[PDB]
Scaffold this motif. Structure first.
Motif, PDB file in Angstrom:
ATOM      1  N   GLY A   1      18.076  76.658  77.676  1.00 62.09           N
ATOM      2  CA  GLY A   1      16.786  76.338  78.225  1.00 62.09           C
ATOM      3  C   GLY A   1      15.878  77.537  78.538  1.00 62.09           C
ATOM      4  N   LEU A   2      14.671  77.226  79.033  1.00 61.93           N
ATOM      5  CA  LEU A   2      13.800  78.221  79.644  1.00 61.93           C
ATOM      6  C   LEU A   2      13.304  77.594  80.932  1.00 61.93           C
ATOM      7  N   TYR A   3      13.173  78.427  81.937  1.00 63.81           N
ATOM      8  CA  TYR A   3      12.936  77.951  83.308  1.00 63.81           C
ATOM      9  C   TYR A   3      11.836  78.722  84.022  1.00 63.81           C
ATOM     10  N   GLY A   4      10.992  79.380  83.260  1.00 66.65           N
ATOM     11  CA  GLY A   4       9.772  80.041  83.781  1.00 66.65           C
ATOM     12  C   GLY A   4       9.655  81.557  83.863  1.00 66.65           C
ATOM     13  N   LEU A   5      10.647  82.326  83.415  1.00 61.67           N
ATOM     14  CA  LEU A   5      10.488  83.790  83.338  1.00 61.67           C
ATOM     15  C   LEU A   5       9.346  84.099  82.420  1.00 61.67           C
ATOM     16  N   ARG A   6       8.530  85.063  82.781  1.00 61.53           N
ATOM     17  CA  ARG A   6       7.368  85.429  81.956  1.00 61.53           C
ATOM     18  C   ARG A   6       7.701  86.584  81.049  1.00 61.53           C
ATOM     19  N   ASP A   7       8.824  87.255  81.305  1.00 59.13           N
ATOM     20  CA  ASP A   7       9.241  88.478  80.573  1.00 59.13           C
ATOM     21  C   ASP A   7      10.704  88.703  80.958  1.00 59.13           C
ATOM     22  N   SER A   8      11.435  89.463  80.194  1.00 61.30           N
ATOM     23  CA  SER A   8      12.830  89.750  80.475  1.00 61.30           C
ATOM     24  C   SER A   8      13.342  90.731  79.448  1.00 61.30           C
TER      25      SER A   8
ATOM     26  N   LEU B   1      10.898  77.107  87.466  1.00 55.58           N
ATOM     27  CA  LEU B   1      11.875  76.487  88.416  1.00 55.58           C
ATOM     28  C   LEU B   1      12.461  77.491  89.374  1.00 55.58           C
ATOM     29  N   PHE B   2      12.339  78.786  89.044  1.00 55.89           N
ATOM     30  CA  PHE B   2      12.686  79.867  89.930  1.00 55.89           C
ATOM     31  C   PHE B   2      11.756  79.956  91.130  1.00 55.89           C
ATOM     32  N   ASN B   3      10.614  79.269  91.095  1.00 61.70           N
ATOM     33  CA  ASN B   3       9.761  79.112  92.313  1.00 61.70           C
ATOM     34  C   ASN B   3      10.096  77.903  93.136  1.00 61.70           C
ATOM     35  N   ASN B   4      11.002  77.060  92.653  1.00 67.59           N
ATOM     36  CA  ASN B   4      11.498  75.958  93.438  1.00 67.59           C
ATOM     37  C   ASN B   4      12.626  76.509  94.274  1.00 67.59           C
ATOM     38  N   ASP B   5      13.104  75.754  95.296  1.00 67.98           N
ATOM     39  CA  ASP B   5      14.275  76.165  96.032  1.00 67.98           C
ATOM     40  C   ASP B   5      15.563  75.852  95.255  1.00 67.98           C
ATOM     41  N   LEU B   6      16.324  76.895  94.934  1.00 61.56           N
ATOM     42  CA  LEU B   6      17.556  76.814  94.155  1.00 61.56           C
ATOM     43  C   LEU B   6      18.743  77.164  95.031  1.00 61.56           C
ATOM     44  N   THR B   7      18.586  77.023  96.351  1.00 57.57           N
ATOM     45  CA  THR B   7      19.612  77.521  97.254  1.00 57.57           C
ATOM     46  C   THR B   7      20.356  76.358  97.905  1.00 57.57           C
ATOM     47  N   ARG B   8      19.921  75.136  97.636  1.00 64.89           N
ATOM     48  CA  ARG B   8      20.550  73.974  98.216  1.00 64.89           C
ATOM     49  C   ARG B   8      20.350  72.740  97.409  1.00 64.89           C
TER      50      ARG B   8
ATOM     51  N   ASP C   1      -0.601  76.563  86.700  1.00 63.09           N
ATOM     52  CA  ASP C   1       0.615  75.698  86.569  1.00 63.09           C
ATOM     53  C   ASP C   1       1.827  76.494  86.122  1.00 63.09           C
ATOM     54  N   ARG C   2       1.628  77.726  85.634  1.00 63.78           N
ATOM     55  CA  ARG C   2       2.754  78.615  85.331  1.00 63.78           C
ATOM     56  C   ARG C   2       3.625  78.899  86.542  1.00 63.78           C
ATOM     57  N   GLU C   3       3.053  78.752  87.735  1.00 66.19           N
ATOM     58  CA  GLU C   3       3.758  79.045  88.979  1.00 66.19           C
ATOM     59  C   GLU C   3       4.314  77.774  89.615  1.00 66.19           C
ATOM     60  N   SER C   4       4.039  76.616  89.040  1.00 68.23           N
ATOM     61  CA  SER C   4       4.527  75.365  89.688  1.00 68.23           C
ATOM     62  C   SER C   4       6.051  75.370  89.739  1.00 68.23           C
ATOM     63  N   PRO C   5       6.631  74.886  90.875  1.00 60.17           N
ATOM     64  CA  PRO C   5       8.085  74.745  91.002  1.00 60.17           C
ATOM     65  C   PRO C   5       8.746  73.715  90.059  1.00 60.17           C
ATOM     66  N   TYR C   6       7.961  73.035  89.203  1.00 60.51           N
ATOM     67  CA  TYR C   6       8.516  72.158  88.121  1.00 60.51           C
ATOM     68  C   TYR C   6       8.295  72.735  86.741  1.00 60.51           C
ATOM     69  N   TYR C   7       7.723  73.916  86.733  1.00 54.68           N
ATOM     70  CA  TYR C   7       7.631  74.709  85.469  1.00 54.68           C
ATOM     71  C   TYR C   7       8.374  76.011  85.614  1.00 54.68           C
TER      72      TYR C   7
ATOM     73  N   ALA D   1      15.770  66.509  87.640  1.00 55.54           N
ATOM     74  CA  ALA D   1      16.718  66.524  88.780  1.00 55.54           C
ATOM     75  C   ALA D   1      16.093  67.082  90.069  1.00 55.54           C
ATOM     76  N   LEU D   2      15.382  68.205  89.965  1.00 51.69           N
ATOM     77  CA  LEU D   2      14.762  68.779  91.152  1.00 51.69           C
ATOM     78  C   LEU D   2      13.611  67.925  91.713  1.00 51.69           C
ATOM     79  N   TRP D   3      12.823  67.309  90.843  1.00 46.35           N
ATOM     80  CA  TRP D   3      11.808  66.350  91.290  1.00 46.35           C
ATOM     81  C   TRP D   3      12.440  65.248  92.146  1.00 46.35           C
ATOM     82  N   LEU D   4      13.514  64.645  91.651  1.00 45.70           N
ATOM     83  CA  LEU D   4      14.193  63.519  92.367  1.00 45.70           C
ATOM     84  C   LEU D   4      14.632  64.019  93.694  1.00 45.70           C
ATOM     85  N   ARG D   5      15.192  65.227  93.717  1.00 49.33           N
ATOM     86  CA  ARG D   5      15.669  65.812  95.002  1.00 49.33           C
ATOM     87  C   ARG D   5      14.498  66.007  95.985  1.00 49.33           C
ATOM     88  N   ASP D   6      13.473  66.682  95.499  1.00 50.65           N
ATOM     89  CA  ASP D   6      12.345  67.153  96.325  1.00 50.65           C
ATOM     90  C   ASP D   6      11.531  65.971  96.881  1.00 50.65           C
TER      91      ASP D   6
END
Lengths: 316, 316
Positions: free
Chosen positions: B193-200, B239-246, B231-237, B172-177
């Motif tokens: 799911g999992l969306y890229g947290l490295r610890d919690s 996803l918290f590094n992608n824009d989630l505000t719009r 690639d751990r930091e990619s906004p498609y891995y 979904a975010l790829w299509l948007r971006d």
């Protein structure tokens, strides 16, 4: 980018602090030497430390395998039931006994215990585990020489804020794990500490220029403190890699609502409680990280001081 | 060690599943090849997929820039209002259209929408972002060919479990971006799911041999999927590094209670909610990760399917 609008969500009390100008100060030297940044911090902290309780104070240098370390004793009364060691915050790179003067004096007033601040060697000059070794050395020196210094070392505690909270619990764990007896550890007082999470819900949602706790800032402080990457996993740095399921002294855990380190506090508490270790957690609504310094202006900061002090004396 | 005693905290219905034996099965081939482990998972999953809804199904191969990939359409009624693409879980290394047959058929049944499962290429043979590009390609193919396939591609959604949920939101975010219009993305259904947290907090408290979600298991799936540490930091891995505000499509986020990955879901929800993005969170009490498969035996798993279906149809 995806962070919460923290400056809008903090309490009106917290905001009055954040909006306070000190017009007599230079600007923050973000491109000065570490030595200059330390000096500015000490200067800027002075206004927040004003009005500290007046009481008997003594300064002594104590021996460590890294050389002598300064300590400051605050003695509220002549029959202290215990001695509380205070480890200050400042990201391991800033802070000293003067930046935390008012916190340590109020803790002494509200506990009616002797409070001993340790001037541990800052990073990057010192690297992990040097400060913790200095703290243990100091504690053990005071325990051996208790009669000469006129302090009660039958029961001790460790207390600290932010990075100092990390030092407080790491010291207590070091004593336990190395079978070192330098007094019974009656309690540990831990205000908005961090304990080794590398990421968390709160780290993602919070942190910015207003507190110096962005991911990048946190990496910077870790880089200054550690000498080897392998130390990331040490159970005196990542305390969650230590055994937290037994023989932990009673811990008072204070969380700041809008602090990215809050989850470190929630994990420590949830871990301790799930394994029947004695603890209490308390969230202080509306606060930023580092709020303990603001007790003159913020009822919430003075409350957090009172609450820790009282948790300690309840163990005696 | 500091972990919670998960097998004691799970619900009675979850425990019935955990304690279910399939005596006719070999033991899990842990030292065997990935091909062997894949075949075993396929075999072991059959019992949990039995008794799925009857419905018209068709297999089709579709072109992508990496070669043709298999898809399966599940057609619950003659007048579908939208098409849901289903991305299966299995850590990126296991699973296929058969292991998730019942999940997809139930989803089609409760939604009354066409469900199209995509047999994305597994890792390590494929690496990120190949699967995501395959899914986008398949979606754009069906969009261009909608009349031929007798599907409604004016509204679409993505749905998945575990790693599949990561693929769902990433797509979904790829299509948007990239500003790709292959149908209006009405919603995204994200189970545990999992969306890229490295610890919690939850990564530290939970995870074990019971769910294959220890820190080392998690590292191993990531190593198989990613070509590079960066690639751990990619906004498609992450996803918290992608824009989630719009412009994030409505997300249904289902957490499993005793799942180390729970905080990934909590973070996604809190982030989207804080930026007024449309979402709903629901926690499914008493559950492990991967519970969607157990719908025949667990009311809660079936409820999770119904809930995601209902959320999707409410966007139409």
């Amino acid at each position: 980018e995806n962070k919460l609008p923290v400056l809008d969500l903090i309490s009106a009390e917290m905001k009055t602090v954040v909006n306070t100008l000190q017009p007599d100060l230079p600007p923050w030297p973000a491109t000065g030497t570490i030595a200059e940044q330390r000096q500015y911090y000490t200067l800027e902290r002075r206004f927040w430390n004003a009005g500290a309780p007046e009481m008997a104070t003594r300064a002594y240098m104590v021996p460590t395998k890294y050389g002598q370390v300064e300590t400051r004793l605050f003695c509220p009364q002549p029959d202290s039931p215990a001695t509380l060691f205070y480890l200050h915050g400042g990201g391991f790179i800033l802070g000293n006994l003067d930046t935390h003067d008012r916190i340590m004096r109020l803790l002494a007033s509200y506990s009616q215990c002797t409070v001993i601040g340790i001037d541990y060697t800052l990073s990057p000059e010192a690297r992990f585990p040097q400060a913790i070794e200095e703290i243990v050395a100091a504690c053990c020196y005071f325990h051996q020489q208790a009669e000469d210094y006129q302090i009660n070392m039958s029961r001790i505690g460790f207390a600290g804020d932010s990075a100092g909270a990390m030092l407080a619990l790491a010291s207590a764990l070091w004593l336990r794990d190395k079978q070192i007896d330098c007094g019974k550890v009656a309690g540990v007082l831990l205000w908005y500490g961090l304990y080794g999470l590398r990421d968390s819900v709160t780290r993602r949602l919070l942190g910015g220029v207003w507190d110096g706790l962005t991911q990048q800032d946190l990496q910077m402080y870790e880089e200054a403190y550690l000498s080897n990457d392998a130390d990331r996993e040490s159970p005196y740095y990542c305390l969650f890699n230590n055994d937290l399921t037994r023989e932990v002294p009673p811990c008072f855990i204070a969380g700041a609502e809008f602090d990215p380190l809050l989850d470190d506090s929630r994990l420590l508490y949830q871990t301790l409680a799930a394994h029947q270790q004695p603890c209490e957690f308390k969230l202080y609504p509306g606060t930023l990280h580092a709020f303990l310094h603001y007790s003159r202006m913020m009822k919430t900061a003075d409350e957090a001081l009172r609450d820790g002090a009282q948790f300690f004396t309840a163990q005696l």
